[PDB]
Amino acid sequence: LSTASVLAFERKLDPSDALMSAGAWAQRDASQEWPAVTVREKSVRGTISNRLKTKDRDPAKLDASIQSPNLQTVDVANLPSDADTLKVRFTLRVLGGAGTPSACNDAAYRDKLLQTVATYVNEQGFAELARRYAHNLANARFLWRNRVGAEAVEVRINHIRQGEVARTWRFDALAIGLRDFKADAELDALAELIASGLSGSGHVLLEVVAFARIGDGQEVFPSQELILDKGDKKGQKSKTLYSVRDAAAIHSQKIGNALRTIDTWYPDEDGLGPIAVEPYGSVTSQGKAYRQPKQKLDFYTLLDNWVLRDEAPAVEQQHYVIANLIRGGVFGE
Amino acid sequence: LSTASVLAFERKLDPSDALMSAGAWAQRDASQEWPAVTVREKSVRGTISNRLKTKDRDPAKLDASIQSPNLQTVDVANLPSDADTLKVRFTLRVLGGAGTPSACNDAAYRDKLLQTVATYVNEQGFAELARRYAHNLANARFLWRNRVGAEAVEVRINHIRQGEVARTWRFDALAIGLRDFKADAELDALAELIASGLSGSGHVLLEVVAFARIGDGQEVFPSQELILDKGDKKGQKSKTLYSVRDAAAIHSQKIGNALRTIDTWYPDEDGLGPIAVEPYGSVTSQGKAYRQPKQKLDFYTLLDNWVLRDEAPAVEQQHYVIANLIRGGVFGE
Amino acid sequence: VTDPEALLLLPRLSIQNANAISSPLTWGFPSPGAFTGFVHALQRRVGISLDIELDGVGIVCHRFEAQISQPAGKRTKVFNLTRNPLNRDGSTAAIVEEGRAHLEVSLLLGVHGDGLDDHPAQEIARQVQEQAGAMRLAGGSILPWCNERFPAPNAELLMLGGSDEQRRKNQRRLTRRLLPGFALVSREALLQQHLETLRTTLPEATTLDALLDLCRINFEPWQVRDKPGWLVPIPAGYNALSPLYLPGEVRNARDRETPLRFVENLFGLGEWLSPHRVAALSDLLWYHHAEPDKGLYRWSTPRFV
DNA sequence: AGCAGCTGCACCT
DNA sequence: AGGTGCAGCTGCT
RNA sequence: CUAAGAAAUUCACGGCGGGCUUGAUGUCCGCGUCUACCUGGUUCACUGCCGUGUAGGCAG
């Protein structure tokens, strides 16, 4: 028995693009007609602040570079001067049926994998994973830089059963930290709903709205696009922000990456905090791979030891493997 | 007698390119001015997630590969943020005269083929194949990934005889599963209609519209294009969705492949579900060919045993070869 | 060669997945031989049973939509393909490139037989429409009726009937239904004229049909040498590479009851024009004729200017 | 008493 | 996201 | 009798870090817009009465 040649997993926990709108705090219950945060342009005169090559550290060349500065156009998004609260809204569907791949070659490999995940579900439910997902919804981690230095963050989560709301959760997202996973009754009820969605025993659709009290006219941070070339035929536009229908918006993969920031079992440390679940669980902001393949704690070696050779790892690493299965991806040769 | 050197069956069950649109649930009766779902672009930045070679498990090399960003441009298609229902509409014409090939070099072989399929219609009608095609139109199998995890799917089929609607069918596509084949009076009436269209007793025209209740602003999945790479050149857009006049669409052959998923008589198993009918019946998702030529259950040897050798196979294998006749093809040496 | 007694108008034919390449040199609109074969199969299917003959096609191409893409670092274009099913060993398939397209075209068909004699015009038009709503045109399916409820019925128009001024008024009111699209004609005379005035430098013929339909940028005596119309390459027809062959003597024929030959494509120049620029609406009818003593098997549109 | 197929291998730029 | 052939091969008789 | 006849692309993803664009300015001289017309084309389908009536008529 060997691993399959092609083997692919569709994602559970599908979010949408989060849209931004603006309003005043304590009108946030009437925040259905709040106007969108629009993306504008402004001019930026760039100074000289890079490290020099020290073949270019001659003072005459430096002053000649300072005398002629370069200029860009830059997309920017601010709150209005009369509104102090950013509202960010998206929808998230929890699907279930996490072990089944969407593509496979070997029948014996997918049957061994299916009974492996069946034994995992029978040992413990999705309660740890859904507890951590509900925590990452409770604290507003999906506000990436908009949460930083906010005065008050409040998350409203609506389980939507038919076209109307079935249940409502209200969270103070600054009390629920970004560091540890506590216990709370409403948080455990949300975790039970997410675990019921992940187990295939229901169809879970939630609407997540987050209100951050930042200040009047302050800068908000939508998702940022990719610029390949830049010339004078444009405005020397050097920064593009993502937008859905003239609304500053966040990419769906950004919200998804902030949802699955649950991995506290990586071997290097635990005082740093959780990271996102990746094969060779890596942080682009730190340029580093936790769970290196030289240690036996990346996703691929753990999966191959669990399925092929029946070496079941510790329950923390089993949580990590099933989290990587819910995350989805292309796993094969 | 021998096989003709050319053999060419024109396809029946011609579908159209299914166009997508969006709106709210319980407005689906007035869903004629529903706006089209459009294809946007966005940027993705990923990490290293695939399997590394055993020579490339070096941790310094892994960190040095991580510290170079991985950026793609991706075509995406979403629902609007105030619509939760995807509407997929296509037209399907049934022609009839399922026996006659478009080309046959041997005259006596085509006469033996014509009386063979004539005797097949005389033995029983198309009602097995017609009931299975009406099942695949009843459950929304043509919603390929859009059906997965949907809240409520609902199919409306309008038979149009003249310029106006002759008859209407209304189905809850989630009650009708994808595994078994039931019997229902409306479903059997549609089966009679498509059987009479297949028998050459008319030219049936159908308009099929499927409403899936996914969620507000969620992602839909149209067809993807085939772009062969410009290898020694710049990087390309790494996903391209199909669109007909700025409306996200599913390919015609994708709907056709979803329609003829009727074959529950392949020898390997019977609980894995129906597959699409083709000679050496092979699914691309499993990557493995059922109905191998080393067993005598593929299309070519069954056709040669029924026509040339006059060994009539079992009634489900006659159903299989009749479905391969309706499917069409270019057969010969 | 034969002036039609009447014209039938296939009003707005939408076609999905039609063949785009249609030639080893062109890739755009399909060849006119496809439309001539369409009306010959239509005459075989419903034309014979009505004491009607059909002779030619006029084509106007209301809209075009090719399934192509430009590969992001080049100025050329590639075709979008389909995923064929797997081989019998389940490995993969062999990629053969085909070019699909979407078309909106109208057809002008000439009639000589007992048109208004045996049957009225409305029933003839309706059953020819019903016959053409069950076949395929150029490798791609005729897309059936959708929420276009207006453009359904045809107009069987008698050519020489009525007064000559009334003839011009009814052909103008039929041209009023052919406004958005641009009709297609053959331009062999313009090809030979430019071939003769180019032969003052060098005697080559394919280099003419190269130089006729590109953007020639001539230096300052920066200008662009321009033709007054929309000159395109077309597959002009077939010229035989072989003598005649009996129905049995070649293996793997389409039928053992019809003679066979090996052929090559002759290429010529066509032209897209506005339909108001032609005064006689029977000038646009593409006839295909055989000269079987040699290989010259032609589609053109004679009696046009 | 062979036959036909069949799989597999190799070529090659 | 190759066509080809042919050497060898299996074989059971 | 149509370079005919046949076809599933597809699974997954964090683009963000930061910035002073500034100084200075005379828009201005001159000019013939005229001649001639039916708003009615039934153009206000109204107001009130007898009659249980919306059925039917009346009076100005």
From TrEMBL, chain C:
CDD domains: Csy2_I-F. It comes from the Bacteria. It holds the Pfam family Cas_Csy2. InterPro entries: CRISPR-assoc_prot_Csy2. NCBIfam families: cas_Csy2. This is Uncharacterized protein. It comes from Pseudomonas aeruginosa. The lineage of its organism: Bacteria, Pseudomonadati, Pseudomonadota, Gammaproteobacteria, Pseudomonadales.
